[PDB]
Write a protein that binds this ligand. Sequence first.
Ligand SMILES: [Cl-]
Ligand SMILES: [Cl-]
Ligand SMILES: [Cl-]
Ligand code: NA
Ligand code: NA
Ligand code: NA
Ligand code: NA
Ligand code: NA
Ligand code: NA
Length: 292
Amino acid sequence: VGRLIYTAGGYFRQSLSYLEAYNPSDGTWLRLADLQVPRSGLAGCVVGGLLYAVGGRNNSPDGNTDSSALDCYNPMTNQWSPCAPMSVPRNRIGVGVIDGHIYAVGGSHGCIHHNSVERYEPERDEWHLVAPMLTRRIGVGVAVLNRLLYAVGGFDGTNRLNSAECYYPERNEWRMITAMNTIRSGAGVCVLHNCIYAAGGYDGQDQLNSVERYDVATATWTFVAPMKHRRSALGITVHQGRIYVLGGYDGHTFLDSVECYDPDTDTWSEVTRMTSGRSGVGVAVTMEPSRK
Ligand SMILES: [Cl-]
Ligand SMILES: [Cl-]
Ligand SMILES: [Cl-]
Ligand code: NA
Ligand code: NA
Ligand code: NA
Ligand code: NA
Ligand code: NA
Ligand code: NA
């Protein structure tokens, strides 16, 4: 019945295997089954109650490799299971879910900065390429609003981006929308109360604490209250009508801070500290694990 905030993987000196679940009510962190492979720069999402870990990169003292992997965690068994991999490795990926399908957007593979996009069908365990973005985007933020897919910011290999573009599944076409006020790579992007939020990131000079919100009806981005802590490569999710931001990098430290945005008051507050600081996590929300 209760839902937890799951954080998977991340980076602190090397990529991490942690899966931990935060209970915003009783404050606990539950330590769950490790990822099969340590990964940073991955994304998390939930479909049908199952948690998915998508893409990323294994930075290890034995060597570094970008990842095409898709893996699925079932809270009712506390077990990970592999899925079919993506067509290419995608480090610093963004993902969104439309109609029960997972869209993997952008990211990098070595020196390749992807504009390509592909779609996963859980009911067939198959990926299929769809139309590529207008822009190559690593560290791209992704959100779904009214069954359209939005790709926000990122880094094209040369320039960091304030542009955003919108994918129409029925047309299989990408269209540019209004750009953000601020250039951001590695921002946290999510949807809350029918608006897209973009929090934090890196503009090529500073890590950011500013937060802006996109309203489709007006096609305008508007600043809201900034986070307490500047952070790039943060994890973000929505739980019970509030945004949570987890970890990240502030130019000096890998943060363990978790901040929570209340839209009704337009206020951020620090609510917990992760068990260790890290950046580049995948985050999503689903039902708590079966006690056993
Ligand atoms: Cl590509
Ligand atoms: Cl919820
Ligand atoms: Cl994520
Ligand atoms: Na592992
Ligand atoms: Na995500
Ligand atoms: Na896989
Ligand atoms: Na298929
Ligand atoms: Na960044
Ligand atoms: Na707005």
